[PDB]
Design an enzyme around this catalytic site. Structure first.
Site, short mmCIF file in Angstrom:
data_model
loop_
_atom_site.label_atom_id
_atom_site.label_comp_id
_atom_site.label_asym_id
_atom_site.label_seq_id
_atom_site.Cartn_x
_atom_site.Cartn_y
_atom_site.Cartn_z
N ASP A 56 0.83 -1.20 0.00
CA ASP A 56 0.00 0.00 0.00
C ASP A 56 0.87 1.25 0.00
O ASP A 56 0.67 2.18 0.79
CB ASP A 56 -0.97 -0.01 1.18
CG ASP A 56 -2.20 0.83 0.93
OD1 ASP A 56 -2.34 1.37 -0.19
OD2 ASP A 56 -3.04 0.97 1.86
N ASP A 98 -6.82 -8.98 4.12
CA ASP A 98 -7.99 -9.67 3.58
C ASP A 98 -9.27 -9.18 4.23
O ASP A 98 -10.31 -9.07 3.57
CB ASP A 98 -7.83 -11.18 3.74
CG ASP A 98 -9.06 -11.95 3.29
OD1 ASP A 98 -9.95 -12.20 4.13
OD2 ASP A 98 -9.14 -12.29 2.09
N1 ANP Z 1 1.17 8.23 12.79
C1 ANP Z 1 0.46 9.25 12.28
N2 ANP Z 1 0.73 10.50 12.70
C2 ANP Z 1 0.03 11.52 12.19
N3 ANP Z 1 -0.96 11.49 11.30
C3 ANP Z 1 -1.21 10.23 10.90
C4 ANP Z 1 -0.57 9.08 11.34
N4 ANP Z 1 -1.09 7.96 10.71
C5 ANP Z 1 -2.03 8.45 9.93
N5 ANP Z 1 -2.16 9.81 10.00
C6 ANP Z 1 -3.09 10.65 9.26
O1 ANP Z 1 -4.36 10.01 9.23
C7 ANP Z 1 -4.88 10.03 7.89
C8 ANP Z 1 -5.83 8.87 7.70
O2 ANP Z 1 -5.06 7.66 7.59
P1 ANP Z 1 -5.65 6.35 6.93
O3 ANP Z 1 -6.65 5.76 7.86
O4 ANP Z 1 -4.54 5.37 6.55
O5 ANP Z 1 -6.35 6.82 5.58
P2 ANP Z 1 -5.51 7.15 4.31
O6 ANP Z 1 -4.24 6.35 4.30
O7 ANP Z 1 -5.14 8.66 4.33
N6 ANP Z 1 -6.41 6.85 2.92
P3 ANP Z 1 -6.75 5.20 2.68
O8 ANP Z 1 -5.57 4.35 3.03
O9 ANP Z 1 -7.10 4.97 1.16
O10 ANP Z 1 -7.99 4.78 3.56
C9 ANP Z 1 -3.64 10.01 7.01
O11 ANP Z 1 -3.92 10.55 5.72
C10 ANP Z 1 -2.67 10.90 7.80
O12 ANP Z 1 -2.83 12.28 7.47
O1 LCJ Z 2 -3.47 0.81 8.39
C1 LCJ Z 2 -3.73 0.10 7.48
N1 LCJ Z 2 -4.60 0.56 6.41
O2 LCJ Z 2 -5.15 1.86 6.42
C2 LCJ Z 2 -6.43 1.79 6.97
C3 LCJ Z 2 -7.43 2.37 5.96
O3 LCJ Z 2 -7.78 3.66 6.37
C4 LCJ Z 2 -3.18 -1.32 7.42
C5 LCJ Z 2 -3.44 -2.10 6.32
C6 LCJ Z 2 -2.96 -3.37 6.26
C7 LCJ Z 2 -2.18 -3.88 7.33
C8 LCJ Z 2 -1.57 -5.12 7.53
N2 LCJ Z 2 -0.96 -5.08 8.71
C9 LCJ Z 2 -1.17 -3.86 9.26
N3 LCJ Z 2 -1.93 -3.13 8.38
C10 LCJ Z 2 -2.41 -1.83 8.46
N4 LCJ Z 2 -2.14 -1.00 9.63
C11 LCJ Z 2 -0.84 -0.50 10.05
C12 LCJ Z 2 0.36 -1.09 9.65
C13 LCJ Z 2 1.57 -0.58 10.09
C14 LCJ Z 2 1.60 0.52 10.94
I1 LCJ Z 2 3.44 1.31 11.61
C15 LCJ Z 2 0.41 1.11 11.34
C16 LCJ Z 2 -0.80 0.59 10.90
F1 LCJ Z 2 -1.97 1.17 11.29
#
Ligand code: ANP
Ligand code: LCJ
Ligand code: ANP
Ligand code: CL
Ligand code: CL
Ligand code: MG
Ligand code: MG
Lengths: 314, 276
Positions: free
Chosen positions: A153, A180
């Protein structure tokens, strides 16, 4: 630790392990909401304070309607994140389950994702993207060499930055059961998936390299590159999900605009975007590419550029 | 307020249940237990609100023993749908979360009541557009209630008078033509039939389709292009052969080749009789 760290990266890695030992078992009532950091297709992220430790963390909450056996295996596989410690990997505090939601507690990155930084920058400079490529390459190399993990991803929203200048990968596939489970539950509007994995072909980390080059093109031109920009749109310098996937599979890959980017940078993303996964460059080939060797030598105040782009103070 | 509109402050909104493809459900109280779904469309334009009100007028007259009762809607403090609250679990929770062990005679009856409710919907010229085991409830463990039907006007954000339709939520029940979103309107009676075919797969296999594929975008592309279809070998050994044939007809890649629910309901009823 035993990794190619400079003395500053090793000191920050030590400091993170130190704070991590103050964190015992994670419980829902030990947290206090501060603010929301954003939401995705299947999750929501909050800035929280772990009151027993005083640490500020990023807490991602995933609501999955799965059988408890799968859920317990997901929490089990996520515990590997305790051993994913690298200057290019987002730190990890704990993964637990409560109130019907999977909580993944990780290090807070005050610069947000490169997807957020992209909208605030319009476009990201090539010399900045050189430092990002080095971080993504070395982050993907750490995950594959030290843990056999494939990211699956790679995209701007999963590359995190902070005001210290660190560039770290996140949301990689450490738990196959989690991949999954969310494949069955949600959908996105775009996709950075390689053309061979769309057709069911598995070529290890070659697909992650495709996703990186696609992300580098998007951040360089300031626009998701599928489909390619149409003529006059480019000199300014709503496809559905299936059409985007069909385009990735059946059309030539995107490319940087000519003239406005150096030839080494154009060649770097072209080697990353070859539809043939075997002809596509791999991690070792990219680390010695002309664009990476040049960017590794350039002195770029990334932390200064980031806070300037966001509006923070140095 | 308008017909079947619930004024502000009438529903006591209680606990948050969860979010789906186009709203967030809360448990509520309003002349008994209700489910209140706060729609994702919070800022509807007069054109969309009028089209939504016209659709509520249709959905509120769809009353059938196998159809989840539509109890009304709200506009203040926000757009919301109010439906009958289901005691128990949805068919998705029974099959894939609790792993309830039904006998074949009961699984056929679940499919028969679902086909009954779907036949009524299509008799009233209503496309469900979202049939899935999550929207099939085993109310008080016996009666099958189908929910989350219609509501096409709020399953997308409106740009004045024209709406862009994007995939939301799970895709495992979407027909190949619904995945592609290319024809004039991908949703039809036959796309509901496909979703019913996937529900038949869940009942007769105990599994979601594509259990061996964890790449969602691979599923979207290959199902949309016709390269991938549910593995009918996962069907359990005690499934009647006529049910496997009926399942294969509902899952035909071309919508013109899928049967309609009057015929589907007649086949399930005949198999329920020609059964030990
Ligand atoms: N460790 C972190 N510190 C600060 N901001 C964070 C962190 N992890 C995630 N974010 C923010 O949270 C948002 C949402 O994360 P996420 O749930 O993965 O959705 P996304 O990756 O942006 N889009 P998608 O993966 O298609 O669902 C991200 O776009 C970042 O801006
Ligand atoms: O976070 C995920 N997908 O995004 C959500 C959609 O919004 C995500 C997706 C797959 C996955 C498999 N094993 C962990 N996985 C995730 N989590 C994750 C992994 C590493 C770190 I460091 C922090 C995390 F939160
Ligand atoms: N009428 C109802 N009675 C009780 N629980 C309900 C009712 N409707 C929905 N729920 C529950 O509320 C939660 C969210 O439902 P919902 O928003 O409809 O998502 P979904 O059904 O899984 N996918 P979708 O219906 O296509 O948006 C689930 O746990 C449902 O079981
Ligand atoms: Cl750097
Ligand atoms: Cl509320
Ligand atoms: Mg993410
Ligand atoms: Mg529902």
């Amino acid at each position: 630790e035993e990794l190619e760290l400079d003395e500053q990266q090793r000191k920050r890695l030590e400091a993170f392990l130190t704070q991590k030992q103050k964190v015992g078992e994670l419980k829902d009532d030990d947290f206090e909401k501060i603010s929301e950091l954003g939401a995705g297709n299947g999750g929501v992220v909050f800035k929280v304070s772990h009151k027993p430790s005083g640490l500020v963390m990023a807490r991602k909450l995933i609501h999955l309607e799965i059988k408890p056996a799968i859920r317990n295996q997901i929490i089990r596989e996520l515990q590997v994140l305790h051993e994913c410690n690298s200057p290019y990997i987002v730190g990890f505090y704990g993964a637990f389950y409560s109130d019907g939601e999977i909580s993944i507690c990780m290090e807070h990155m005050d610069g947000g994702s490169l997807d957020q930084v992209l909208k605030k920058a319009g476009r990201i400079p090539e010399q900045i993207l050189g430092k990002v490529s080095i971080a993504v390459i070395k982050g993907l190399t750490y995950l594959r060499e030290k843990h056999k993990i494939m990211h699956r991803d790679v995209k701007p929203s999963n590359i995190l930055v902070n005001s210290r200048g660190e560039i770290k990968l996140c949301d990689f596939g450490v738990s196959g059961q989690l991949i999954d489970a969310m494949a069955n539950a949600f959908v996105g509007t775009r996709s950075y998936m390689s053309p061979e994995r769309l057709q069911g072909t598995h070529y290890s980390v070659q697909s992650d390299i495709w996703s990186m080059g696609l992300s580098l093109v998007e951040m360089a031109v300031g626009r998701y590159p599928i489909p390619p920009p149409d003529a006059k749109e480019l000199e300014l310098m709503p496809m559905a999900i299936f059409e985007l996937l069909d385009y990735i599979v059946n059309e030539p890959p995107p490319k940087l605009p000519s003239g406005v980017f150096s030839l080494e940078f154009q060649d770097f993303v072209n080697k990353c975007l070859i539809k043939n996964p075997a002809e596509r460059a791999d991690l070792k080939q990219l680390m010695v590419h002309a664009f990476i060797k040049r960017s590794d030598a350039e002195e770029v105040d990334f932390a200064g550029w980031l806070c300037s782009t966001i509006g923070l103070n140095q | 307020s308008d017909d079947w509109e619930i004024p502000d402050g009438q529903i006591t909104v209680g606990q948050r249940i969860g979010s789906g493809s186009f709203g967030t459900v809360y448990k509520g109280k309003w002349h008994g237990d209700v489910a209140v779904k706060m729609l994702n469309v919070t800022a509807p334009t007069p054109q969309q609100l009028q089209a939504f009100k016209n659709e509520v007028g249709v959905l509120r007259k769809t009353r059938h023993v196998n159809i989840l009762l539509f109890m009304g809607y709200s506009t203040k403090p926000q757009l919301a749908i109010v439906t009958q609250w289901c005691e128990g679990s949805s068919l998705y929770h029974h099959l894939h979360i609790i792993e309830t062990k039904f006998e074949m005679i009961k699984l056929i009856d679940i499919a028969r009541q679902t086909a009954q409710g779907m036949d009524y919907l299509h008799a009233k010229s209503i496309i469900h557009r979202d049939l899935k085991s999550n929207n099939i409830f085993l109310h008080e463990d016996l009666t099958v209630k189908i929910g989350d039907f219609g509501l096409a006007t709020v399953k997308s954000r409106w740009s004045g008078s024209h709406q862009f339709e994007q995939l939301s939520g799970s895709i495992l029940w979407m027909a190949p033509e619904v995945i592609r979103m290319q024809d004039k309107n991908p949703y039809s009676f036959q796309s509901d039939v496909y979703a019913f075919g996937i529900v038949l797969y869940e009942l007769m296999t105990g599994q979601l389709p594509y259990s061996n594929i964890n790449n969602r975008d691979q599923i979207i592309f290959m199902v949309g292009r016709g390269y991938l279809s549910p593995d009918l070998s996962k069907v359990r050994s005690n499934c009647p052969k006529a049910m496997k044939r009926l399942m294969a007809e509902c899952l035909k890649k071309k919508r013109d080749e899928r049967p309609l629910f009057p015929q589907i309901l007649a086949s399930i009823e005949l198999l329920a009789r020609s059964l030990p």
